[PDB]
Amino acid sequence: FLGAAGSTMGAASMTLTVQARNLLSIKQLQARVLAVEHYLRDQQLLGIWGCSGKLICCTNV
Amino acid sequence: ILKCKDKKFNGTGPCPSVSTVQCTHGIKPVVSTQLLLNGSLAEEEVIIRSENITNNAKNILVQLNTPVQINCTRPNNNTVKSIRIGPGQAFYYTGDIIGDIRQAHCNVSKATWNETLGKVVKQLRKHFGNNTIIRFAQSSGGDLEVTTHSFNCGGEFFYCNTSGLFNSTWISNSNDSITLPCRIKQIINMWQRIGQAMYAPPIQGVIRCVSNITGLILTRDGGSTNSTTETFRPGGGDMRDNWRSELYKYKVVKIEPLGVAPTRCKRFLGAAGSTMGAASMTLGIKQLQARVLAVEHYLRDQQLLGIWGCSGKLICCTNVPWNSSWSNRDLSEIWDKMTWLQWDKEISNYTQIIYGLLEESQNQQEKNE
Amino acid sequence: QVQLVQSGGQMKKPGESMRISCRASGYEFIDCTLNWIRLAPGKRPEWMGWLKPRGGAVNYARPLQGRVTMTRDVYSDTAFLELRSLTVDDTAVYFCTRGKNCDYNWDFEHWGRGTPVIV
Amino acid sequence: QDLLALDKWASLWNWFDITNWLWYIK
Amino acid sequence: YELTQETGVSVALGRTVTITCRGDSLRSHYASWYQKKPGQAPILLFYGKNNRPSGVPDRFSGSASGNRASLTISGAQAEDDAEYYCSSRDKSGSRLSVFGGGTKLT
Amino acid sequence: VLTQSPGTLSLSPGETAIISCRTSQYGSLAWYQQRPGQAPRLVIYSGSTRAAGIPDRFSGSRWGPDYNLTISNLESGDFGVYYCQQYEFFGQGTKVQV
Amino acid sequence: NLWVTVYYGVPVWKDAETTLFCASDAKEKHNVWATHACVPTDPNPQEIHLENVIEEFNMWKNNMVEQMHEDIISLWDQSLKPCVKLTPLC
Amino acid sequence: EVQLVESGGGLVKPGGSLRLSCSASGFDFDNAWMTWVRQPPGKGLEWVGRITGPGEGWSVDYAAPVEGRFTISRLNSINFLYLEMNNLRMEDSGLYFCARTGKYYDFWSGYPPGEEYFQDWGRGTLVTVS
Ligand SMILES: *[C@@H]1O[C@H](CO)[C@@H](O[C@@H]2O[C@H](CO)[C@@H](O[C@@H]3O[C@H](CO)[C@@H](O)[C@H](O[C@H]4O[C@H](CO)[C@@H](O)[C@H](O)[C@@H]4O)[C@@H]3O)[C@H](O)[C@H]2NC(C)=O)[C@H](O)[C@H]1NC(C)=O
Ligand SMILES: *[C@@H]1O[C@H](CO)[C@@H](O[C@@H]2O[C@H](CO)[C@@H](O[C@@H]3O[C@H](CO)[C@@H](O)[C@H](O)[C@@H]3O)[C@H](O)[C@H]2NC(C)=O)[C@H](O)[C@H]1NC(C)=O
Ligand SMILES: *[C@@H]1O[C@H](CO)[C@@H](O)[C@H](O)[C@H]1NC(C)=O
Ligand SMILES: *[C@@H]1O[C@H](CO)[C@@H](O)[C@H](O)[C@H]1NC(C)=O
Ligand SMILES: *[C@@H]1O[C@H](CO)[C@@H](O)[C@H](O)[C@H]1NC(C)=O
Ligand SMILES: *[C@@H]1O[C@H](CO)[C@@H](O)[C@H](O)[C@H]1NC(C)=O
Ligand SMILES: *[C@@H]1O[C@H](CO)[C@@H](O)[C@H](O)[C@H]1NC(C)=O
Ligand SMILES: *[C@@H]1O[C@H](CO)[C@@H](O)[C@H](O)[C@H]1NC(C)=O
């Protein structure tokens, strides 16, 4: 999951998946709907920037 | 919700005639103990259901293909009076009786009930020997909810003896009414719980009902080997046994739309019974938890489609080759002879392996490099 | 923890009646079936009947119908067996038993201490 | 944009037109 | 049919005899002829007007007599005799390779 | 409906005891042991599965309607009275002695 | 030779236990068995008959009955909650 | 060994529809194009239609009675030739055959589109309307 967090970049890029898979993995309803809201906000923000995949986009900024 | 439409289905085992729905039919929560009232009737003949018909502890559920009408009344012309017992509270109680007191009772047509018992005996003789004498007797014991047919009628709660309905022996080869005495109880404890009860207020006037007996609950005595006769007594058992007579058709199924298959490209629930390939081209608070779960499940599938490099829908080719060890029929048969369910069974134990290989380990080679 | 504390041990004459008790503990008494078993030396163990609380439904063995009664107190969690008419043949030790997993009643994992009755 | 264009090797494309000037030129 | 045919012929168990099938479009196109014993998979006796595919009976012979595609069967085998079929384009220039039915070799 | 092997079976400690119970009816079959002066215990359940706390020495089953219980390496705690239950029934009851 | 292909929408179902919502017809909101909160029902339910397929049912072990029993008890208690207590009647 | 196992179709009212599949394994499905033909039981083979080569148009040509009735498709990924037959009449029946069409042409006697041949067929699949 958070393994390679203290590792250098590039080597840790191969672990990007283990971060995206584990997002979204009455109190329980509140917590899970909050997680859904965060994940969906993140995906909307990624889509606005021109992305659709969970891997790297490199753009023109 | 899958439902078995096989007319002779007896509760367990394969069902060749399956349909799918989103909602069950209207089920009346009818509360009754020995005889199941209203509900739904069998289509062809009387159906006997038991988890193990030879087991003496499991209740036998009988479903009738025809109703037996059961009228019931509370003769008493009962006038209710109410008093105030506190701020904003009123206690309702029987004021008095005008006419003769009389007794509550039920009527079951004698010839119809005898014919129904004949049908039940005919069915029971299939599960047991064909030379066995089938004896119907009254309930052997228990509290008033079990020993007596307990039900609701017009707001009152009737408890009827039913010793006149199950009083017979059946050897292996008009217009009269069987009158069942019935008592009325105002202090009620349904779904018997330690420390809870209800006071059912009396209903003014005379009460009558008309209802269909559509099922029975029976229990065998057993314990003897040489007797040659089987005694079937009514028994209330548990209240769940009522709704087992109504939800016997239905089974809830989770939908798992995702699948993987071998193919030569490298980048509704209909037709479930149709083989693959043909199917490919052919294709209050409870409600809130319920909708939320679906949303999560939806995103879960999309999340998988996110990491597999398939942002599209329906079909996508991927760059992981098919290992021969993953149950290989060579692709001529799997897509012709085998259904999706069977294929899923074939690779269920291996599924996490392909999910592992289709993970972004492949898409790091394909999208980052 | 499942413990059936059985109580009795009364010497009786022929023709009289007997009653013994079995208090349940550990498990919820209401949602699990009880059975009554008799063991006599040199004889088959005879199953006498079963009692389901939550309704107190009873099934008596066919040889003993009319002579055996089983009732219960839900609030004391105590099943009661009674025999109306004993004989010399009723000499036996009586056991109050419970299924190993009530879903299936006929696995008598739990037994009482045993109540000898001599006639 | 199904498998169409996924495997694109066509030098003898439009055979029902390759016929139309196979021997007509002759 | 457009590729008109013969109902059938008879056999002598050792004959070298022809069976025919008419239809103008064949004068413009090539010819196709098949063998189909009932209850079995049909085979192709001739691939093209002047050529036959591998595995064809060696005794089989004959190519064509114009729009009356005719071919000869030699060394008449009783089991083999079965029935045979005809086909070619229905209109000159069209792609509809009509199946012009067949002949009872009998 | 249920029958058993001879009830006077006598073995010293250490040998293998074979107890045969024949059953006429279908159903899950359990094996019970009764010590002297104590209540019976469930030894085998569902034909072949041992109860919790029972050593591995108690085992055995048979597909057909002739179940066999094998008791290898008897200790002093064994040598009780053995019964074979099928639903309500228990059979004659066979004693194991020295 | 062969490549893994991902098909979404495959007709593969696995058994399960989940939550289910009441759906009545129209409804005097004085019925003990009415929560006055069940979505309207479908006038034309989408009952889809399947092709040839055998499904192993077991009415004795499904969770629809347990869930219905729990729902019925909860609904009855909910109905009885705002009513007279009859403590001084003993 | 080009096995052509075609399995589909059955009893149906005069008006209706159905869906026949023709598997194929042991050759190059990806470019070689295929045909369907019908043989009504009291009749000989009659030509139905044929998908065109992928890259040769990828289109279909129906037959004189069948035009507007049937439809042909191929999923080359799974080597399957599907035929949807809809808006049925009563003469529609028989052991419907699926075969692998070929392309044949030569000079001298050249004429477009030339001719094709049905080498490797399937076993057969009965369809009968009532
Ligand atoms: C099995 O189904 C049958 C058929 O539906 C069912 O019998 C029906 O019972 C109801 C409830 O008692 C009856 O409806 C009553 O009928 C009379 C008509 O005059 C009225 O007295 C009643 O209205 C009074 O009570 C209402 C409260 O329930 C008040 O809102 C109202 O103001 C009145 O005070 C009430 O409408 C119905 O008539 C019968 N059906 C027949 C054909 O007789 C039976 O009860 C079901 N089985 C079981 C076990 O419940
Ligand atoms: C009553 O309970 C029993 C046991 O729980 C149910 O299953 C029965 O189990 C026995 C084995 O204990 C099956 O025996 C089988 O018989 C044949 C012999 O040729 C063979 O197929 C197997 O090797 C096996 O020995 C028995 O068949 C099986 N009963 C059924 C009907 O399948 C039993 O079903 C329950 N009784 C009912 C539902 O009536
Ligand atoms: C009734 O249950 C038995 C097993 O007890 C099963 O074999 C049988 O198929 C069931 N009947 C039907 C019609 O499915
Ligand atoms: C019930 O009463 C109706 C009239 O209300 C009558 O027609 C019917 O016969 C009665 N049923 C029986 C079983 O007597
Ligand atoms: C019921 O019918 C049986 C024959 O099926 C007959 O012997 C019996 O006497 C009848 N009983 C009554 C009470 O009419
Ligand atoms: C039903 O009537 C019989 C008549 O013998 C009687 O013994 C029995 O106690 C009655 N049932 C109840 C619950 O009182
Ligand atoms: C009960 O008796 C009263 C006496 O006034 C009468 O008005 C009323 O109609 C009676 N009720 C019934 C249901 O017969
Ligand atoms: C009893 O069943 C019949 C036949 O299905 C039905 O017409 C009738 O309405 C039912 N009676 C009641 C009171 O619901």
Side-chain angles (χ1 to χ4, degrees), chain B residues 10 12 50-55 127, chain C residues 104, chain F residues 25-29 63-64 67 86-87:
Chain B
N10 43 262
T12 317
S50 174
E51 189 176 350
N52 243 93
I53 196 73
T54 60
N55 199 354
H127 295 286
Chain C
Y104 186 76
Chain F
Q25 300 294 296
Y26 291 102
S28 79
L29 209 162
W63 170 87
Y67 290 73
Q86 157 149 287
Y87 285 121

PDB file of all heavy atoms in Angstrom, chain B residues 10 12 50-55 127, chain C residues 104, chain F residues 25-29 63-64 67 86-87, ligand 2:
ATOM      1  N   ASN B  10     -40.218 -28.465  -4.998  1.00  0.00           N
ATOM      2  CA  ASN B  10     -40.430 -28.770  -3.587  1.00  0.00           C
ATOM      3  C   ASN B  10     -39.278 -28.256  -2.735  1.00  0.00           C
ATOM      4  O   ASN B  10     -38.753 -28.955  -1.868  1.00  0.00           O
ATOM      5  CB  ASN B  10     -40.665 -30.265  -3.360  1.00  0.00           C
ATOM      6  CG  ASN B  10     -39.740 -31.161  -4.162  1.00  0.00           C
ATOM      7  OD1 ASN B  10     -40.116 -31.663  -5.218  1.00  0.00           O
ATOM      8  ND2 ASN B  10     -38.540 -31.396  -3.649  1.00  0.00           N
ATOM      9  N   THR B  12     -36.069 -27.472  -2.699  1.00  0.00           N
ATOM     10  CA  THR B  12     -34.638 -27.724  -2.719  1.00  0.00           C
ATOM     11  C   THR B  12     -34.246 -28.341  -4.049  1.00  0.00           C
ATOM     12  O   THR B  12     -35.058 -28.987  -4.715  1.00  0.00           O
ATOM     13  CB  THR B  12     -34.240 -28.660  -1.570  1.00  0.00           C
ATOM     14  OG1 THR B  12     -34.928 -28.267  -0.376  1.00  0.00           O
ATOM     15  CG2 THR B  12     -32.743 -28.623  -1.314  1.00  0.00           C
ATOM     16  N   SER B  50     -40.059 -30.390   2.913  1.00  0.00           N
ATOM     17  CA  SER B  50     -39.376 -30.641   4.171  1.00  0.00           C
ATOM     18  C   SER B  50     -37.880 -30.675   3.919  1.00  0.00           C
ATOM     19  O   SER B  50     -37.437 -31.171   2.880  1.00  0.00           O
ATOM     20  CB  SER B  50     -39.820 -31.959   4.797  1.00  0.00           C
ATOM     21  OG  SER B  50     -39.047 -32.238   5.947  1.00  0.00           O
ATOM     22  N   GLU B  51     -37.106 -30.146   4.868  1.00  0.00           N
ATOM     23  CA  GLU B  51     -35.654 -30.206   4.740  1.00  0.00           C
ATOM     24  C   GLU B  51     -35.174 -31.649   4.751  1.00  0.00           C
ATOM     25  O   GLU B  51     -34.243 -32.009   4.023  1.00  0.00           O
ATOM     26  CB  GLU B  51     -34.998 -29.402   5.858  1.00  0.00           C
ATOM     27  CG  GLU B  51     -33.506 -29.223   5.690  1.00  0.00           C
ATOM     28  CD  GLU B  51     -32.905 -28.341   6.762  1.00  0.00           C
ATOM     29  OE1 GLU B  51     -33.675 -27.724   7.527  1.00  0.00           O
ATOM     30  OE2 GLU B  51     -31.661 -28.264   6.842  1.00  0.00           O
ATOM     31  N   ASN B  52     -35.781 -32.481   5.587  1.00  0.00           N
ATOM     32  CA  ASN B  52     -35.602 -33.930   5.526  1.00  0.00           C
ATOM     33  C   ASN B  52     -36.903 -34.551   6.004  1.00  0.00           C
ATOM     34  O   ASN B  52     -37.207 -34.504   7.198  1.00  0.00           O
ATOM     35  CB  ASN B  52     -34.428 -34.401   6.373  1.00  0.00           C
ATOM     36  CG  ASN B  52     -33.339 -35.035   5.550  1.00  0.00           C
ATOM     37  OD1 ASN B  52     -32.386 -34.378   5.142  1.00  0.00           O
ATOM     38  ND2 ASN B  52     -33.478 -36.331   5.295  1.00  0.00           N
ATOM     39  N   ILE B  53     -37.664 -35.132   5.075  1.00  0.00           N
ATOM     40  CA  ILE B  53     -38.986 -35.651   5.407  1.00  0.00           C
ATOM     41  C   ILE B  53     -38.898 -36.733   6.472  1.00  0.00           C
ATOM     42  O   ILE B  53     -39.843 -36.929   7.244  1.00  0.00           O
ATOM     43  CB  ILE B  53     -39.688 -36.147   4.123  1.00  0.00           C
ATOM     44  CG1 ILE B  53     -41.192 -36.336   4.348  1.00  0.00           C
ATOM     45  CG2 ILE B  53     -39.048 -37.435   3.571  1.00  0.00           C
ATOM     46  CD1 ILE B  53     -41.983 -35.052   4.451  1.00  0.00           C
ATOM     47  N   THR B  54     -37.780 -37.451   6.540  1.00  0.00           N
ATOM     48  CA  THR B  54     -37.610 -38.454   7.577  1.00  0.00           C
ATOM     49  C   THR B  54     -37.210 -37.859   8.918  1.00  0.00           C
ATOM     50  O   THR B  54     -37.295 -38.558   9.931  1.00  0.00           O
ATOM     51  CB  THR B  54     -36.552 -39.475   7.156  1.00  0.00           C
ATOM     52  OG1 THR B  54     -35.304 -38.811   6.945  1.00  0.00           O
ATOM     53  CG2 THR B  54     -36.960 -40.183   5.870  1.00  0.00           C
ATOM     54  N   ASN B  55     -36.786 -36.598   8.956  1.00  0.00           N
ATOM     55  CA  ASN B  55     -36.372 -35.981  10.207  1.00  0.00           C
ATOM     56  C   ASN B  55     -37.599 -35.599  11.025  1.00  0.00           C
ATOM     57  O   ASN B  55     -38.540 -34.996  10.504  1.00  0.00           O
ATOM     58  CB  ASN B  55     -35.508 -34.756   9.922  1.00  0.00           C
ATOM     59  CG  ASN B  55     -34.678 -34.344  11.102  1.00  0.00           C
ATOM     60  OD1 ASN B  55     -34.807 -34.901  12.184  1.00  0.00           O
ATOM     61  ND2 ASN B  55     -33.801 -33.371  10.898  1.00  0.00           N
ATOM     62  N   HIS B 127     -43.690 -40.000  -0.235  1.00  0.00           N
ATOM     63  CA  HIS B 127     -42.446 -39.877   0.513  1.00  0.00           C
ATOM     64  C   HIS B 127     -42.210 -41.070   1.427  1.00  0.00           C
ATOM     65  O   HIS B 127     -41.055 -41.425   1.687  1.00  0.00           O
ATOM     66  CB  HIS B 127     -42.460 -38.587   1.321  1.00  0.00           C
ATOM     67  CG  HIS B 127     -42.469 -37.353   0.477  1.00  0.00           C
ATOM     68  ND1 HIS B 127     -41.356 -36.906  -0.201  1.00  0.00           N
ATOM     69  CD2 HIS B 127     -43.460 -36.478   0.192  1.00  0.00           C
ATOM     70  CE1 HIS B 127     -41.661 -35.805  -0.863  1.00  0.00           C
ATOM     71  NE2 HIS B 127     -42.931 -35.524  -0.641  1.00  0.00           N
TER      72      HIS B 127
ATOM     73  N   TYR C 104     -29.260 -28.542  13.317  1.00  0.00           N
ATOM     74  CA  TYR C 104     -29.471 -29.986  13.219  1.00  0.00           C
ATOM     75  C   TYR C 104     -29.569 -30.552  14.630  1.00  0.00           C
ATOM     76  O   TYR C 104     -28.566 -30.616  15.347  1.00  0.00           O
ATOM     77  CB  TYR C 104     -28.341 -30.660  12.451  1.00  0.00           C
ATOM     78  CG  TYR C 104     -28.583 -32.123  12.195  1.00  0.00           C
ATOM     79  CD1 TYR C 104     -29.472 -32.533  11.220  1.00  0.00           C
ATOM     80  CD2 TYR C 104     -27.933 -33.093  12.930  1.00  0.00           C
ATOM     81  CE1 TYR C 104     -29.700 -33.864  10.977  1.00  0.00           C
ATOM     82  CE2 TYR C 104     -28.156 -34.431  12.694  1.00  0.00           C
ATOM     83  CZ  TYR C 104     -29.041 -34.808  11.716  1.00  0.00           C
ATOM     84  OH  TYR C 104     -29.273 -36.139  11.471  1.00  0.00           O
TER      85      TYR C 104
ATOM     86  N   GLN F  25     -31.956 -47.124   7.545  1.00  0.00           N
ATOM     87  CA  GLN F  25     -32.393 -45.856   6.984  1.00  0.00           C
ATOM     88  C   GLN F  25     -31.202 -44.966   6.646  1.00  0.00           C
ATOM     89  O   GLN F  25     -30.108 -45.114   7.191  1.00  0.00           O
ATOM     90  CB  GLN F  25     -33.315 -45.123   7.961  1.00  0.00           C
ATOM     91  CG  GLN F  25     -34.585 -45.872   8.334  1.00  0.00           C
ATOM     92  CD  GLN F  25     -35.526 -46.051   7.159  1.00  0.00           C
ATOM     93  OE1 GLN F  25     -36.039 -45.077   6.607  1.00  0.00           O
ATOM     94  NE2 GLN F  25     -35.768 -47.300   6.779  1.00  0.00           N
ATOM     95  N   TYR F  26     -31.437 -44.029   5.735  1.00  0.00           N
ATOM     96  CA  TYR F  26     -30.463 -42.991   5.445  1.00  0.00           C
ATOM     97  C   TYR F  26     -30.482 -41.941   6.547  1.00  0.00           C
ATOM     98  O   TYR F  26     -31.518 -41.681   7.163  1.00  0.00           O
ATOM     99  CB  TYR F  26     -30.773 -42.320   4.109  1.00  0.00           C
ATOM    100  CG  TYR F  26     -30.561 -43.195   2.899  1.00  0.00           C
ATOM    101  CD1 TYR F  26     -31.634 -43.787   2.253  1.00  0.00           C
ATOM    102  CD2 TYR F  26     -29.291 -43.416   2.392  1.00  0.00           C
ATOM    103  CE1 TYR F  26     -31.447 -44.581   1.142  1.00  0.00           C
ATOM    104  CE2 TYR F  26     -29.094 -44.207   1.283  1.00  0.00           C
ATOM    105  CZ  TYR F  26     -30.175 -44.787   0.661  1.00  0.00           C
ATOM    106  OH  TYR F  26     -29.985 -45.580  -0.446  1.00  0.00           O
ATOM    107  N   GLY F  27     -29.335 -41.337   6.793  1.00  0.00           N
ATOM    108  CA  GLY F  27     -29.232 -40.261   7.761  1.00  0.00           C
ATOM    109  C   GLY F  27     -27.839 -40.180   8.339  1.00  0.00           C
ATOM    110  O   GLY F  27     -27.056 -41.123   8.298  1.00  0.00           O
ATOM    111  N   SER F  28     -27.521 -39.010   8.886  1.00  0.00           N
ATOM    112  CA  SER F  28     -26.239 -38.831   9.549  1.00  0.00           C
ATOM    113  C   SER F  28     -26.166 -39.710  10.786  1.00  0.00           C
ATOM    114  O   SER F  28     -27.105 -39.758  11.585  1.00  0.00           O
ATOM    115  CB  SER F  28     -26.043 -37.373   9.946  1.00  0.00           C
ATOM    116  OG  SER F  28     -26.773 -37.080  11.124  1.00  0.00           O
ATOM    117  N   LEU F  29     -25.035 -40.388  10.951  1.00  0.00           N
ATOM    118  CA  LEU F  29     -24.838 -41.355  12.022  1.00  0.00           C
ATOM    119  C   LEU F  29     -23.747 -40.852  12.955  1.00  0.00           C
ATOM    120  O   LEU F  29     -22.678 -40.440  12.495  1.00  0.00           O
ATOM    121  CB  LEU F  29     -24.484 -42.721  11.440  1.00  0.00           C
ATOM    122  CG  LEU F  29     -24.909 -43.932  12.268  1.00  0.00           C
ATOM    123  CD1 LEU F  29     -24.904 -45.161  11.419  1.00  0.00           C
ATOM    124  CD2 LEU F  29     -24.003 -44.167  13.431  1.00  0.00           C
ATOM    125  N   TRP F  63     -18.882 -45.996   3.234  1.00  0.00           N
ATOM    126  CA  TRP F  63     -19.864 -45.453   2.304  1.00  0.00           C
ATOM    127  C   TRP F  63     -21.212 -46.153   2.442  1.00  0.00           C
ATOM    128  O   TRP F  63     -22.254 -45.500   2.567  1.00  0.00           O
ATOM    129  CB  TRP F  63     -19.344 -45.568   0.870  1.00  0.00           C
ATOM    130  CG  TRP F  63     -20.378 -45.245  -0.156  1.00  0.00           C
ATOM    131  CD1 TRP F  63     -20.676 -44.014  -0.651  1.00  0.00           C
ATOM    132  CD2 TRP F  63     -21.254 -46.167  -0.815  1.00  0.00           C
ATOM    133  NE1 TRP F  63     -21.683 -44.107  -1.575  1.00  0.00           N
ATOM    134  CE2 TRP F  63     -22.059 -45.419  -1.692  1.00  0.00           C
ATOM    135  CE3 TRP F  63     -21.439 -47.550  -0.743  1.00  0.00           C
ATOM    136  CZ2 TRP F  63     -23.032 -46.008  -2.497  1.00  0.00           C
ATOM    137  CZ3 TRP F  63     -22.404 -48.134  -1.542  1.00  0.00           C
ATOM    138  CH2 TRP F  63     -23.189 -47.364  -2.406  1.00  0.00           C
ATOM    139  N   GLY F  64     -21.210 -47.487   2.437  1.00  0.00           N
ATOM    140  CA  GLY F  64     -22.432 -48.231   2.490  1.00  0.00           C
ATOM    141  C   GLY F  64     -23.098 -48.130   3.846  1.00  0.00           C
ATOM    142  O   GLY F  64     -22.620 -47.432   4.750  1.00  0.00           O
ATOM    143  N   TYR F  67     -21.534 -48.936   9.074  1.00  0.00           N
ATOM    144  CA  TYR F  67     -20.510 -48.038   9.584  1.00  0.00           C
ATOM    145  C   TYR F  67     -19.608 -48.774  10.564  1.00  0.00           C
ATOM    146  O   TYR F  67     -20.071 -49.606  11.349  1.00  0.00           O
ATOM    147  CB  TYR F  67     -21.166 -46.839  10.263  1.00  0.00           C
ATOM    148  CG  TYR F  67     -21.865 -45.895   9.313  1.00  0.00           C
ATOM    149  CD1 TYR F  67     -23.070 -46.239   8.719  1.00  0.00           C
ATOM    150  CD2 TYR F  67     -21.341 -44.646   9.041  1.00  0.00           C
ATOM    151  CE1 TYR F  67     -23.716 -45.378   7.868  1.00  0.00           C
ATOM    152  CE2 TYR F  67     -21.982 -43.776   8.190  1.00  0.00           C
ATOM    153  CZ  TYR F  67     -23.172 -44.148   7.608  1.00  0.00           C
ATOM    154  OH  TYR F  67     -23.820 -43.288   6.757  1.00  0.00           O
ATOM    155  N   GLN F  86     -28.750 -42.816  14.961  1.00  0.00           N
ATOM    156  CA  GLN F  86     -29.147 -42.389  13.597  1.00  0.00           C
ATOM    157  C   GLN F  86     -30.481 -41.682  13.836  1.00  0.00           C
ATOM    158  O   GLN F  86     -31.472 -42.393  14.103  1.00  0.00           O
ATOM    159  CB  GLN F  86     -29.309 -43.559  12.630  1.00  0.00           C
ATOM    160  CG  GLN F  86     -30.215 -43.212  11.457  1.00  0.00           C
ATOM    161  CD  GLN F  86     -29.850 -43.943  10.192  1.00  0.00           C
ATOM    162  OE1 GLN F  86     -28.851 -43.643   9.541  1.00  0.00           O
ATOM    163  NE2 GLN F  86     -30.670 -44.916   9.833  1.00  0.00           N
ATOM    164  N   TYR F  87     -30.497 -40.348  13.824  1.00  0.00           N
ATOM    165  CA  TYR F  87     -31.741 -39.620  14.200  1.00  0.00           C
ATOM    166  C   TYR F  87     -32.103 -40.051  15.630  1.00  0.00           C
ATOM    167  O   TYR F  87     -31.222 -40.015  16.504  1.00  0.00           O
ATOM    168  CB  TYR F  87     -32.871 -39.867  13.194  1.00  0.00           C
ATOM    169  CG  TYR F  87     -32.726 -39.132  11.869  1.00  0.00           C
ATOM    170  CD1 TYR F  87     -32.671 -39.825  10.665  1.00  0.00           C
ATOM    171  CD2 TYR F  87     -32.652 -37.746  11.822  1.00  0.00           C
ATOM    172  CE1 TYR F  87     -32.543 -39.160   9.456  1.00  0.00           C
ATOM    173  CE2 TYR F  87     -32.523 -37.070  10.620  1.00  0.00           C
ATOM    174  CZ  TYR F  87     -32.468 -37.780   9.433  1.00  0.00           C
ATOM    175  OH  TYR F  87     -32.342 -37.120   8.244  1.00  0.00           O
TER     176      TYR F  87
HETATM  177  C1  LIG I   2     -32.525 -37.068   4.506  1.00  0.00           C
HETATM  178  O1  LIG I   2     -31.200 -36.832   4.911  1.00  0.00           O
HETATM  179  C2  LIG I   2     -30.215 -37.475   4.130  1.00  0.00           C
HETATM  180  C3  LIG I   2     -28.890 -37.297   4.822  1.00  0.00           C
HETATM  181  O2  LIG I   2     -28.846 -35.999   5.360  1.00  0.00           O
HETATM  182  C4  LIG I   2     -30.299 -36.873   2.726  1.00  0.00           C
HETATM  183  O3  LIG I   2     -29.289 -37.258   1.806  1.00  0.00           O
HETATM  184  C5  LIG I   2     -29.094 -38.669   1.604  1.00  0.00           C
HETATM  185  O4  LIG I   2     -27.786 -39.020   1.989  1.00  0.00           O
HETATM  186  C6  LIG I   2     -27.371 -40.335   1.703  1.00  0.00           C
HETATM  187  C7  LIG I   2     -26.006 -40.543   2.316  1.00  0.00           C
HETATM  188  O5  LIG I   2     -26.070 -40.208   3.681  1.00  0.00           O
HETATM  189  C8  LIG I   2     -27.423 -40.574   0.190  1.00  0.00           C
HETATM  190  O6  LIG I   2     -27.007 -41.877  -0.155  1.00  0.00           O
HETATM  191  C9  LIG I   2     -26.584 -41.941  -1.538  1.00  0.00           C
HETATM  192  O7  LIG I   2     -27.145 -43.073  -2.163  1.00  0.00           O
HETATM  193  C10 LIG I   2     -26.725 -43.536  -3.436  1.00  0.00           C
HETATM  194  C11 LIG I   2     -26.639 -45.059  -3.402  1.00  0.00           C
HETATM  195  O8  LIG I   2     -26.702 -45.504  -4.739  1.00  0.00           O
HETATM  196  C12 LIG I   2     -25.469 -42.881  -4.018  1.00  0.00           C
HETATM  197  O9  LIG I   2     -25.832 -41.927  -4.997  1.00  0.00           O
HETATM  198  C13 LIG I   2     -24.560 -42.127  -3.022  1.00  0.00           C
HETATM  199  O10 LIG I   2     -23.274 -42.686  -2.951  1.00  0.00           O
HETATM  200  C14 LIG I   2     -25.071 -42.044  -1.568  1.00  0.00           C
HETATM  201  O11 LIG I   2     -24.687 -43.151  -0.800  1.00  0.00           O
HETATM  202  C15 LIG I   2     -28.875 -40.397  -0.220  1.00  0.00           C
HETATM  203  O12 LIG I   2     -29.114 -40.575  -1.590  1.00  0.00           O
HETATM  204  C16 LIG I   2     -29.317 -38.984   0.117  1.00  0.00           C
HETATM  205  N1  LIG I   2     -30.686 -38.850  -0.311  1.00  0.00           N
HETATM  206  C17 LIG I   2     -31.066 -38.329  -1.494  1.00  0.00           C
HETATM  207  C18 LIG I   2     -32.556 -38.292  -1.743  1.00  0.00           C
HETATM  208  O13 LIG I   2     -30.273 -37.920  -2.328  1.00  0.00           O
HETATM  209  C19 LIG I   2     -31.657 -37.244   2.152  1.00  0.00           C
HETATM  210  O14 LIG I   2     -31.849 -36.699   0.878  1.00  0.00           O
HETATM  211  C20 LIG I   2     -32.744 -36.680   3.043  1.00  0.00           C
HETATM  212  N2  LIG I   2     -34.033 -37.165   2.616  1.00  0.00           N
HETATM  213  C21 LIG I   2     -34.963 -36.570   1.833  1.00  0.00           C
HETATM  214  C22 LIG I   2     -34.695 -35.192   1.277  1.00  0.00           C
HETATM  215  O15 LIG I   2     -36.016 -37.125   1.562  1.00  0.00           O
END
